[PDB]
Amino acid sequence: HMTEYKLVVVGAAGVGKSALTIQLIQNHFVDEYDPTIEDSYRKQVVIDGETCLLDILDTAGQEEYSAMRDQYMRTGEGFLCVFAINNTKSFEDIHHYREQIKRVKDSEDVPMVLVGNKSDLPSRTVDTKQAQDLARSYGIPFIETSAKTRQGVDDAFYTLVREIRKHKEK
Ligand SMILES: Nc1nc2c(ncn2[C@@H]2O[C@H](COP(=O)(O)OP(=O)(O)O)[C@@H](O)[C@H]2O)c(=O)[nH]1
Ligand SMILES: [Mg+2]
Ligand code: NA
């Protein structure tokens, strides 16, 4: 009685991958989540009249190999590619995350959303138009989030589900 959607959250250390996932699931902002915990979470939610079971991998620790992450990259249906709007380097890093996904899928048409997180912080070094340019180039949506205030968080995830449906029958 539910449709499963396999989602993968990627991006540089410290951008708020865990914070966004935890906010989606618990409606809580977690100040201090272990940067090393990689794991999958489940969320049941009704999106456009369909009862969805989201199966979400919150990735961590790019440095080392991971059997879980390997399985999710190969079989994941969509990707949230996250940078922080006060972390220029994380924005610059998006290129590499996107290339890695393109390679695993042997494809340039992969359901993905570019997410610019920490929108509540005043120290903004990546402008919305830089992000809009980058997403336009990739042919993907751009959404600004705050895992702290929850602004944009459901939007990011609902939009990814919709991009998955645009790509394949579910
Ligand atoms: N102010 C603010 N801080 C955030 C936001 N998202 C995450 N953080 C903080 O940024 C740091 C890294 O978040 P975390 O989720 O562990 O990042 P991860 O390494 O990508 O999983 C933590 O202190 C979080 O409390 C946000 O939207 N706003
Ligand atoms: Mg994390
Ligand atoms: Na959170």
Curated annotation (Swiss-Prot):
It is an enzyme of class 3 (hydrolase). One of its GO terms (molecular function) is protein-membrane adaptor activity. Changing A147V: In OES; somatic mutation. Coiled coil: none annotated. Ras proteins bind GDP/GTP and possess intrinsic GTPase activity. Plays an important role in the regulation of cell proliferation. Plays a role in promoting oncogenic events by inducing transcriptional silencing of tumor suppressor genes (TSGs) in colorectal cancer (CRC) cells in a ZNF304-dependent manner. GTP binds at residues 11-19, 30-36, 60-61, 117-120. Acetylation at Lys-105 prevents interaction with guanine nucleotide exchange factors (GEFs). This is GTPase KRas. It comes from the Eukaryota. A motif (Effector region) lies at residues 33-41.
